[PDB]
Amino acid sequence: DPVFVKDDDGYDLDSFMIPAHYKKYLTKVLVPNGVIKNRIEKLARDVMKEMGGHHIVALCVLKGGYKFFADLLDYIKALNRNSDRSIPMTVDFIRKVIGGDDLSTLTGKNVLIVEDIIDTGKTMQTLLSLVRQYNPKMVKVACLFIKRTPLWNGFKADFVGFSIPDHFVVGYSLDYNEIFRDLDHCCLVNDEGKKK
Amino acid sequence: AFDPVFVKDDDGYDLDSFMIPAHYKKYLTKVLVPNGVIKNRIEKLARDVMKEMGGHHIVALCVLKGGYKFFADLLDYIKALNRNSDRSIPMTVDFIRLKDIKVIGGDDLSTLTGKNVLIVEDIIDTGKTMQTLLSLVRQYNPKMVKVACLFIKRTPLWNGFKADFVGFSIPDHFVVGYSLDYNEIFRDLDHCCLVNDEGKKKYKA
């Protein structure tokens, strides 16, 4: 079960380390880097408890969100090397696979579809359908954030970090732009910053 | 800017949200503040400290109440900033115990004159200790006296003392984890948590 970030839940800009020039473009901090890190650690723990019995192949959906992947994989790897028996762990990236083809390599394996933010479910549901055609041992979906969109027209994921309100978020590496490249915390944007 | 992060009475996280050793969960109800938020805040407090006192010799007076995790962390962040600045300043560490009152280290209250002294404590509840120390340090005319603290509890027993650099404002519930002493029973606990009636029963004596 995800961490529930309430609508008006959040933090002041001066509460944590944020570079001075970004402050002009931000409303508040939703989730600090440290909470993200801590939650990703548990997600990784949850993944290994459920999938760690067999070869895991992580499929990262490239949306311009490298930071979550890096941290998630790191904790997965750390748990893999700290467990008594080591397990094969393959990581591929989807745009079509960058690795990658054929997807026949997915058969008999434990597949983890990794997305950093789920908005509608569309992108995920397509891959869920796609990978199931290749008969994997199991399919699970990992995600840092799910936006509580009223228009949530999809599924509930297996491993989810935070449940957040349907606002535009930047920081960490969530924003596809490289304009908040130095912002480590998940922050929602004001009117001046949403330009863009 | 210096205002502490407010942790509302009903704020917190489920015990399954983060990584907690399985045996501890019996004695806990909720996570109040996760290790990562604590660290993030401490980092800001260090910047704050340095913004105000980084101009001259800092003596950090650490008040002996159980562990020293907070002191060590705060100072490590401060030390990092002191290396990466144009003019590095001297820094001294001293431990202090209330009774009354004697300084453990190279300094004495009397040798604090002309220095930026930072009084560091884990948690302020009543505010009595800090006020006493503030008055003790001020007698020896230091360049400045500032008070840094990780937590402040909201209690009607609070004396009105306002510390300079406080991390979190927390409810009047007894908390364990991170640096908070529980007679070292929650020594492998990284997150600040609330103890249940069963856990409080396990503390005695």
PDB file of N, CA and C in Angstrom, chain A residues 53-139:
ATOM      1  N   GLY A  53      12.569 -14.823  -5.874  1.00  0.00           N
ATOM      2  CA  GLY A  53      12.755 -16.267  -5.960  1.00  0.00           C
ATOM      3  C   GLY A  53      13.245 -16.735  -7.317  1.00  0.00           C
ATOM      4  N   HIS A  54      13.122 -15.867  -8.318  1.00  0.00           N
ATOM      5  CA  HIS A  54      13.483 -16.201  -9.694  1.00  0.00           C
ATOM      6  C   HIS A  54      14.030 -14.987 -10.452  1.00  0.00           C
ATOM      7  N   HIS A  55      14.768 -15.259 -11.528  1.00  0.00           N
ATOM      8  CA  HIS A  55      15.277 -14.249 -12.454  1.00  0.00           C
ATOM      9  C   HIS A  55      14.296 -13.090 -12.624  1.00  0.00           C
ATOM     10  N   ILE A  56      14.756 -11.885 -12.308  1.00  0.00           N
ATOM     11  CA  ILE A  56      13.948 -10.685 -12.469  1.00  0.00           C
ATOM     12  C   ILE A  56      14.438  -9.882 -13.665  1.00  0.00           C
ATOM     13  N   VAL A  57      13.507  -9.508 -14.539  1.00  0.00           N
ATOM     14  CA  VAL A  57      13.817  -8.590 -15.629  1.00  0.00           C
ATOM     15  C   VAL A  57      12.976  -7.318 -15.508  1.00  0.00           C
ATOM     16  N   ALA A  58      13.648  -6.233 -15.133  1.00  0.00           N
ATOM     17  CA  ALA A  58      13.002  -4.946 -14.939  1.00  0.00           C
ATOM     18  C   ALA A  58      12.891  -4.206 -16.263  1.00  0.00           C
ATOM     19  N   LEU A  59      11.679  -3.753 -16.563  1.00  0.00           N
ATOM     20  CA  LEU A  59      11.401  -2.980 -17.761  1.00  0.00           C
ATOM     21  C   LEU A  59      11.094  -1.543 -17.370  1.00  0.00           C
ATOM     22  N   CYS A  60      12.049  -0.646 -17.603  1.00  0.00           N
ATOM     23  CA  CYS A  60      11.881   0.765 -17.251  1.00  0.00           C
ATOM     24  C   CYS A  60      11.303   1.558 -18.412  1.00  0.00           C
ATOM     25  N   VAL A  61      10.179   2.224 -18.161  1.00  0.00           N
ATOM     26  CA  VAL A  61       9.533   3.048 -19.179  1.00  0.00           C
ATOM     27  C   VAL A  61      10.162   4.436 -19.191  1.00  0.00           C
ATOM     28  N   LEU A  62      10.814   4.762 -20.301  1.00  0.00           N
ATOM     29  CA  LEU A  62      11.532   6.021 -20.440  1.00  0.00           C
ATOM     30  C   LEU A  62      10.586   7.185 -20.717  1.00  0.00           C
ATOM     31  N   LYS A  63      10.415   8.034 -19.709  1.00  0.00           N
ATOM     32  CA  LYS A  63       9.594   9.234 -19.824  1.00  0.00           C
ATOM     33  C   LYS A  63      10.421  10.462 -19.467  1.00  0.00           C
ATOM     34  N   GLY A  64      11.720  10.248 -19.277  1.00  0.00           N
ATOM     35  CA  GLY A  64      12.625  11.289 -18.796  1.00  0.00           C
ATOM     36  C   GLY A  64      12.673  11.314 -17.279  1.00  0.00           C
ATOM     37  N   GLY A  65      12.668  10.128 -16.668  1.00  0.00           N
ATOM     38  CA  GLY A  65      12.687  10.001 -15.213  1.00  0.00           C
ATOM     39  C   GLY A  65      13.712   8.991 -14.739  1.00  0.00           C
ATOM     40  N   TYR A  66      14.984   9.328 -14.940  1.00  0.00           N
ATOM     41  CA  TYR A  66      16.089   8.416 -14.643  1.00  0.00           C
ATOM     42  C   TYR A  66      16.359   8.194 -13.150  1.00  0.00           C
ATOM     43  N   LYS A  67      16.052   9.188 -12.320  1.00  0.00           N
ATOM     44  CA  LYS A  67      16.438   9.169 -10.904  1.00  0.00           C
ATOM     45  C   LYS A  67      15.776   8.043 -10.124  1.00  0.00           C
ATOM     46  N   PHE A  68      14.474   7.863 -10.331  1.00  0.00           N
ATOM     47  CA  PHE A  68      13.736   6.790  -9.671  1.00  0.00           C
ATOM     48  C   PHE A  68      14.294   5.419 -10.051  1.00  0.00           C
ATOM     49  N   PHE A  69      14.550   5.216 -11.343  1.00  0.00           N
ATOM     50  CA  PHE A  69      15.132   3.968 -11.831  1.00  0.00           C
ATOM     51  C   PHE A  69      16.427   3.664 -11.091  1.00  0.00           C
ATOM     52  N   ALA A  70      17.332   4.643 -11.082  1.00  0.00           N
ATOM     53  CA  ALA A  70      18.647   4.513 -10.449  1.00  0.00           C
ATOM     54  C   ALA A  70      18.564   4.070  -8.990  1.00  0.00           C
ATOM     55  N   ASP A  71      17.714   4.735  -8.218  1.00  0.00           N
ATOM     56  CA  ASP A  71      17.569   4.429  -6.803  1.00  0.00           C
ATOM     57  C   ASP A  71      16.891   3.082  -6.579  1.00  0.00           C
ATOM     58  N   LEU A  72      15.831   2.804  -7.341  1.00  0.00           N
ATOM     59  CA  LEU A  72      15.105   1.532  -7.226  1.00  0.00           C
ATOM     60  C   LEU A  72      16.024   0.352  -7.505  1.00  0.00           C
ATOM     61  N   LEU A  73      16.723   0.409  -8.639  1.00  0.00           N
ATOM     62  CA  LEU A  73      17.679  -0.626  -9.028  1.00  0.00           C
ATOM     63  C   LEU A  73      18.791  -0.807  -7.997  1.00  0.00           C
ATOM     64  N   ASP A  74      19.302   0.306  -7.471  1.00  0.00           N
ATOM     65  CA  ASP A  74      20.354   0.275  -6.457  1.00  0.00           C
ATOM     66  C   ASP A  74      19.957  -0.533  -5.232  1.00  0.00           C
ATOM     67  N   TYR A  75      18.759  -0.270  -4.717  1.00  0.00           N
ATOM     68  CA  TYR A  75      18.247  -1.016  -3.579  1.00  0.00           C
ATOM     69  C   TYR A  75      17.968  -2.481  -3.928  1.00  0.00           C
ATOM     70  N   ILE A  76      17.401  -2.728  -5.112  1.00  0.00           N
ATOM     71  CA  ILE A  76      17.231  -4.094  -5.626  1.00  0.00           C
ATOM     72  C   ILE A  76      18.576  -4.835  -5.627  1.00  0.00           C
ATOM     73  N   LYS A  77      19.588  -4.219  -6.238  1.00  0.00           N
ATOM     74  CA  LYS A  77      20.935  -4.790  -6.305  1.00  0.00           C
ATOM     75  C   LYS A  77      21.527  -5.067  -4.922  1.00  0.00           C
ATOM     76  N   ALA A  78      21.360  -4.108  -4.012  1.00  0.00           N
ATOM     77  CA  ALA A  78      21.880  -4.214  -2.647  1.00  0.00           C
ATOM     78  C   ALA A  78      21.248  -5.386  -1.904  1.00  0.00           C
ATOM     79  N   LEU A  79      19.946  -5.567  -2.108  1.00  0.00           N
ATOM     80  CA  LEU A  79      19.213  -6.668  -1.499  1.00  0.00           C
ATOM     81  C   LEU A  79      19.609  -7.996  -2.130  1.00  0.00           C
ATOM     82  N   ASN A  80      19.802  -7.976  -3.448  1.00  0.00           N
ATOM     83  CA  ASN A  80      20.254  -9.144  -4.190  1.00  0.00           C
ATOM     84  C   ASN A  80      21.600  -9.638  -3.671  1.00  0.00           C
ATOM     85  N   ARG A  81      22.538  -8.720  -3.451  1.00  0.00           N
ATOM     86  CA  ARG A  81      23.866  -9.106  -2.970  1.00  0.00           C
ATOM     87  C   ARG A  81      23.920  -9.399  -1.459  1.00  0.00           C
ATOM     88  N   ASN A  82      22.934  -8.916  -0.704  1.00  0.00           N
ATOM     89  CA  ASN A  82      22.860  -9.182   0.739  1.00  0.00           C
ATOM     90  C   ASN A  82      22.091 -10.448   1.099  1.00  0.00           C
ATOM     91  N   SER A  83      21.289 -10.943   0.160  1.00  0.00           N
ATOM     92  CA  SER A  83      20.571 -12.199   0.347  1.00  0.00           C
ATOM     93  C   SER A  83      21.547 -13.365   0.227  1.00  0.00           C
ATOM     94  N   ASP A  84      21.191 -14.505   0.814  1.00  0.00           N
ATOM     95  CA  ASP A  84      22.093 -15.659   0.862  1.00  0.00           C
ATOM     96  C   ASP A  84      22.365 -16.269  -0.512  1.00  0.00           C
ATOM     97  N   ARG A  85      21.348 -16.284  -1.368  1.00  0.00           N
ATOM     98  CA  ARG A  85      21.494 -16.761  -2.738  1.00  0.00           C
ATOM     99  C   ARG A  85      21.247 -15.617  -3.715  1.00  0.00           C
ATOM    100  N   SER A  86      22.170 -15.434  -4.657  1.00  0.00           N
ATOM    101  CA  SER A  86      22.048 -14.383  -5.670  1.00  0.00           C
ATOM    102  C   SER A  86      21.143 -14.800  -6.821  1.00  0.00           C
ATOM    103  N   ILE A  87      20.466 -13.812  -7.392  1.00  0.00           N
ATOM    104  CA  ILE A  87      19.488 -14.029  -8.449  1.00  0.00           C
ATOM    105  C   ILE A  87      19.830 -13.168  -9.674  1.00  0.00           C
ATOM    106  N   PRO A  88      19.649 -13.722 -10.891  1.00  0.00           N
ATOM    107  CA  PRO A  88      19.859 -12.943 -12.113  1.00  0.00           C
ATOM    108  C   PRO A  88      18.882 -11.777 -12.201  1.00  0.00           C
ATOM    109  N   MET A  89      19.388 -10.628 -12.635  1.00  0.00           N
ATOM    110  CA  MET A  89      18.601  -9.409 -12.665  1.00  0.00           C
ATOM    111  C   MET A  89      18.930  -8.639 -13.937  1.00  0.00           C
ATOM    112  N   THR A  90      18.043  -8.731 -14.924  1.00  0.00           N
ATOM    113  CA  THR A  90      18.237  -8.068 -16.212  1.00  0.00           C
ATOM    114  C   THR A  90      17.411  -6.786 -16.265  1.00  0.00           C
ATOM    115  N   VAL A  91      18.003  -5.710 -16.777  1.00  0.00           N
ATOM    116  CA  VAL A  91      17.275  -4.452 -16.918  1.00  0.00           C
ATOM    117  C   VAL A  91      17.232  -4.000 -18.373  1.00  0.00           C
ATOM    118  N   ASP A  92      16.018  -3.813 -18.876  1.00  0.00           N
ATOM    119  CA  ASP A  92      15.795  -3.270 -20.206  1.00  0.00           C
ATOM    120  C   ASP A  92      15.001  -1.963 -20.143  1.00  0.00           C
ATOM    121  N   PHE A  93      15.003  -1.239 -21.257  1.00  0.00           N
ATOM    122  CA  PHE A  93      14.366   0.066 -21.343  1.00  0.00           C
ATOM    123  C   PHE A  93      13.463   0.144 -22.568  1.00  0.00           C
ATOM    124  N   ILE A  94      12.272   0.699 -22.375  1.00  0.00           N
ATOM    125  CA  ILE A  94      11.272   0.790 -23.442  1.00  0.00           C
ATOM    126  C   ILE A  94      10.951   2.237 -23.822  1.00  0.00           C
ATOM    127  N   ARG A  95      10.720   2.455 -25.116  1.00  0.00           N
ATOM    128  CA  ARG A  95      10.547   3.796 -25.678  1.00  0.00           C
ATOM    129  C   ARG A  95       9.071   4.174 -25.784  1.00  0.00           C
ATOM    130  N   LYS A  96       8.736  -0.407 -28.373  1.00  0.00           N
ATOM    131  CA  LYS A  96      10.093  -0.734 -28.801  1.00  0.00           C
ATOM    132  C   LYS A  96      11.073  -0.784 -27.627  1.00  0.00           C
ATOM    133  N   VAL A  97      11.947  -1.786 -27.650  1.00  0.00           N
ATOM    134  CA  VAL A  97      12.941  -1.991 -26.602  1.00  0.00           C
ATOM    135  C   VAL A  97      14.310  -1.520 -27.078  1.00  0.00           C
ATOM    136  N   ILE A  98      15.006  -0.791 -26.212  1.00  0.00           N
ATOM    137  CA  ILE A  98      16.349  -0.295 -26.506  1.00  0.00           C
ATOM    138  C   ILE A  98      17.374  -1.436 -26.454  1.00  0.00           C
ATOM    139  N   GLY A  99      17.100  -2.435 -25.617  1.00  0.00           N
ATOM    140  CA  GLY A  99      17.969  -3.605 -25.435  1.00  0.00           C
ATOM    141  C   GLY A  99      18.277  -4.416 -26.686  1.00  0.00           C
ATOM    142  N   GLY A 100      17.427  -5.384 -27.025  1.00  0.00           N
ATOM    143  CA  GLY A 100      16.238  -5.722 -26.249  1.00  0.00           C
ATOM    144  C   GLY A 100      15.439  -6.840 -26.896  1.00  0.00           C
ATOM    145  N   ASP A 101      15.097  -6.647 -28.171  1.00  0.00           N
ATOM    146  CA  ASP A 101      14.343  -7.633 -28.941  1.00  0.00           C
ATOM    147  C   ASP A 101      15.148  -8.932 -29.075  1.00  0.00           C
ATOM    148  N   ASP A 102      14.485 -10.090 -29.097  1.00  0.00           N
ATOM    149  CA  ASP A 102      13.031 -10.217 -29.001  1.00  0.00           C
ATOM    150  C   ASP A 102      12.560 -10.104 -27.549  1.00  0.00           C
ATOM    151  N   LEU A 103      11.255  -9.910 -27.372  1.00  0.00           N
ATOM    152  CA  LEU A 103      10.631  -9.947 -26.054  1.00  0.00           C
ATOM    153  C   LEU A 103      10.333 -11.385 -25.620  1.00  0.00           C
ATOM    154  N   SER A 104      10.749 -12.352 -26.441  1.00  0.00           N
ATOM    155  CA  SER A 104      10.596 -13.771 -26.121  1.00  0.00           C
ATOM    156  C   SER A 104      11.438 -14.152 -24.906  1.00  0.00           C
ATOM    157  N   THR A 105      12.459 -13.346 -24.635  1.00  0.00           N
ATOM    158  CA  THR A 105      13.325 -13.516 -23.471  1.00  0.00           C
ATOM    159  C   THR A 105      12.572 -13.317 -22.154  1.00  0.00           C
ATOM    160  N   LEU A 106      11.348 -12.804 -22.246  1.00  0.00           N
ATOM    161  CA  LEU A 106      10.518 -12.531 -21.072  1.00  0.00           C
ATOM    162  C   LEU A 106       9.793 -13.766 -20.531  1.00  0.00           C
ATOM    163  N   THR A 107       9.805 -14.856 -21.298  1.00  0.00           N
ATOM    164  CA  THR A 107       9.107 -16.080 -20.903  1.00  0.00           C
ATOM    165  C   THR A 107       9.786 -16.803 -19.733  1.00  0.00           C
ATOM    166  N   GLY A 108       8.971 -17.227 -18.769  1.00  0.00           N
ATOM    167  CA  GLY A 108       9.454 -17.938 -17.587  1.00  0.00           C
ATOM    168  C   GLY A 108      10.144 -17.052 -16.566  1.00  0.00           C
ATOM    169  N   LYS A 109      10.100 -15.742 -16.793  1.00  0.00           N
ATOM    170  CA  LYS A 109      10.794 -14.775 -15.944  1.00  0.00           C
ATOM    171  C   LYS A 109       9.818 -13.964 -15.089  1.00  0.00           C
ATOM    172  N   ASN A 110      10.356 -13.293 -14.072  1.00  0.00           N
ATOM    173  CA  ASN A 110       9.594 -12.355 -13.257  1.00  0.00           C
ATOM    174  C   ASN A 110       9.804 -10.932 -13.763  1.00  0.00           C
ATOM    175  N   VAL A 111       8.778 -10.394 -14.414  1.00  0.00           N
ATOM    176  CA  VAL A 111       8.871  -9.098 -15.079  1.00  0.00           C
ATOM    177  C   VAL A 111       8.336  -7.972 -14.198  1.00  0.00           C
ATOM    178  N   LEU A 112       9.124  -6.904 -14.074  1.00  0.00           N
ATOM    179  CA  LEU A 112       8.708  -5.711 -13.347  1.00  0.00           C
ATOM    180  C   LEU A 112       8.683  -4.493 -14.260  1.00  0.00           C
ATOM    181  N   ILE A 113       7.481  -4.030 -14.574  1.00  0.00           N
ATOM    182  CA  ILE A 113       7.316  -2.823 -15.369  1.00  0.00           C
ATOM    183  C   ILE A 113       7.459  -1.623 -14.440  1.00  0.00           C
ATOM    184  N   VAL A 114       8.479  -0.813 -14.704  1.00  0.00           N
ATOM    185  CA  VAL A 114       8.856   0.286 -13.824  1.00  0.00           C
ATOM    186  C   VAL A 114       8.590   1.637 -14.480  1.00  0.00           C
ATOM    187  N   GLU A 115       7.648   2.371 -13.904  1.00  0.00           N
ATOM    188  CA  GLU A 115       7.293   3.704 -14.370  1.00  0.00           C
ATOM    189  C   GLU A 115       7.406   4.631 -13.167  1.00  0.00           C
ATOM    190  N   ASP A 116       7.809   5.880 -13.379  1.00  0.00           N
ATOM    191  CA  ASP A 116       8.005   6.784 -12.240  1.00  0.00           C
ATOM    192  C   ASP A 116       6.720   7.467 -11.774  1.00  0.00           C
ATOM    193  N   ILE A 117       5.812   7.709 -12.716  1.00  0.00           N
ATOM    194  CA  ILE A 117       4.547   8.366 -12.421  1.00  0.00           C
ATOM    195  C   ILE A 117       3.419   7.807 -13.298  1.00  0.00           C
ATOM    196  N   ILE A 118       2.363   7.312 -12.656  1.00  0.00           N
ATOM    197  CA  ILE A 118       1.177   6.837 -13.370  1.00  0.00           C
ATOM    198  C   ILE A 118       0.069   7.890 -13.308  1.00  0.00           C
ATOM    199  N   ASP A 119      -0.371   8.347 -14.480  1.00  0.00           N
ATOM    200  CA  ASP A 119      -1.402   9.381 -14.577  1.00  0.00           C
ATOM    201  C   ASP A 119      -2.750   8.786 -14.999  1.00  0.00           C
ATOM    202  N   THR A 120      -2.780   8.140 -16.166  1.00  0.00           N
ATOM    203  CA  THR A 120      -4.009   7.536 -16.695  1.00  0.00           C
ATOM    204  C   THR A 120      -3.995   6.007 -16.625  1.00  0.00           C
ATOM    205  N   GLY A 121      -2.802   5.420 -16.710  1.00  0.00           N
ATOM    206  CA  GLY A 121      -2.648   3.968 -16.748  1.00  0.00           C
ATOM    207  C   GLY A 121      -2.462   3.438 -18.158  1.00  0.00           C
ATOM    208  N   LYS A 122      -2.768   4.277 -19.149  1.00  0.00           N
ATOM    209  CA  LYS A 122      -2.708   3.906 -20.568  1.00  0.00           C
ATOM    210  C   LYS A 122      -1.394   3.219 -20.936  1.00  0.00           C
ATOM    211  N   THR A 123      -0.283   3.916 -20.713  1.00  0.00           N
ATOM    212  CA  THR A 123       1.043   3.407 -21.063  1.00  0.00           C
ATOM    213  C   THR A 123       1.327   2.063 -20.402  1.00  0.00           C
ATOM    214  N   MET A 124       0.936   1.939 -19.135  1.00  0.00           N
ATOM    215  CA  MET A 124       1.169   0.729 -18.354  1.00  0.00           C
ATOM    216  C   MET A 124       0.322  -0.443 -18.852  1.00  0.00           C
ATOM    217  N   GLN A 125      -0.970  -0.188 -19.053  1.00  0.00           N
ATOM    218  CA  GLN A 125      -1.927  -1.212 -19.478  1.00  0.00           C
ATOM    219  C   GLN A 125      -1.563  -1.841 -20.819  1.00  0.00           C
ATOM    220  N   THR A 126      -0.966  -1.035 -21.694  1.00  0.00           N
ATOM    221  CA  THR A 126      -0.506  -1.490 -23.003  1.00  0.00           C
ATOM    222  C   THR A 126       0.622  -2.505 -22.853  1.00  0.00           C
ATOM    223  N   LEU A 127       1.557  -2.201 -21.957  1.00  0.00           N
ATOM    224  CA  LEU A 127       2.706  -3.061 -21.699  1.00  0.00           C
ATOM    225  C   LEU A 127       2.286  -4.309 -20.945  1.00  0.00           C
ATOM    226  N   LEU A 128       1.369  -4.142 -19.993  1.00  0.00           N
ATOM    227  CA  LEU A 128       0.773  -5.268 -19.279  1.00  0.00           C
ATOM    228  C   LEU A 128       0.187  -6.282 -20.254  1.00  0.00           C
ATOM    229  N   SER A 129      -0.600  -5.787 -21.209  1.00  0.00           N
ATOM    230  CA  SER A 129      -1.152  -6.611 -22.274  1.00  0.00           C
ATOM    231  C   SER A 129      -0.043  -7.215 -23.126  1.00  0.00           C
ATOM    232  N   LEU A 130       0.969  -6.407 -23.434  1.00  0.00           N
ATOM    233  CA  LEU A 130       2.049  -6.810 -24.330  1.00  0.00           C
ATOM    234  C   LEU A 130       2.900  -7.935 -23.747  1.00  0.00           C
ATOM    235  N   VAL A 131       3.312  -7.779 -22.492  1.00  0.00           N
ATOM    236  CA  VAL A 131       4.192  -8.753 -21.843  1.00  0.00           C
ATOM    237  C   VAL A 131       3.493 -10.081 -21.529  1.00  0.00           C
ATOM    238  N   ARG A 132       2.186 -10.023 -21.275  1.00  0.00           N
ATOM    239  CA  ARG A 132       1.394 -11.215 -20.967  1.00  0.00           C
ATOM    240  C   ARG A 132       1.273 -12.159 -22.156  1.00  0.00           C
ATOM    241  N   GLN A 133       1.515 -11.625 -23.349  1.00  0.00           N
ATOM    242  CA  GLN A 133       1.509 -12.411 -24.576  1.00  0.00           C
ATOM    243  C   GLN A 133       2.768 -13.270 -24.705  1.00  0.00           C
ATOM    244  N   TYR A 134       3.748 -13.026 -23.837  1.00  0.00           N
ATOM    245  CA  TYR A 134       5.012 -13.767 -23.862  1.00  0.00           C
ATOM    246  C   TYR A 134       5.181 -14.755 -22.704  1.00  0.00           C
ATOM    247  N   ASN A 135       4.080 -15.046 -22.009  1.00  0.00           N
ATOM    248  CA  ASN A 135       4.037 -16.027 -20.914  1.00  0.00           C
ATOM    249  C   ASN A 135       5.156 -15.907 -19.869  1.00  0.00           C
ATOM    250  N   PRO A 136       5.174 -14.797 -19.108  1.00  0.00           N
ATOM    251  CA  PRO A 136       6.147 -14.690 -18.028  1.00  0.00           C
ATOM    252  C   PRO A 136       5.622 -15.340 -16.749  1.00  0.00           C
ATOM    253  N   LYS A 137       6.528 -15.748 -15.859  1.00  0.00           N
ATOM    254  CA  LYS A 137       6.132 -16.334 -14.577  1.00  0.00           C
ATOM    255  C   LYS A 137       5.161 -15.418 -13.836  1.00  0.00           C
ATOM    256  N   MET A 138       5.492 -14.131 -13.796  1.00  0.00           N
ATOM    257  CA  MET A 138       4.613 -13.122 -13.221  1.00  0.00           C
ATOM    258  C   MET A 138       4.881 -11.752 -13.834  1.00  0.00           C
ATOM    259  N   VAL A 139       3.886 -10.875 -13.745  1.00  0.00           N
ATOM    260  CA  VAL A 139       4.055  -9.480 -14.121  1.00  0.00           C
ATOM    261  C   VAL A 139       3.613  -8.599 -12.967  1.00  0.00           C
TER     262      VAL A 139
END
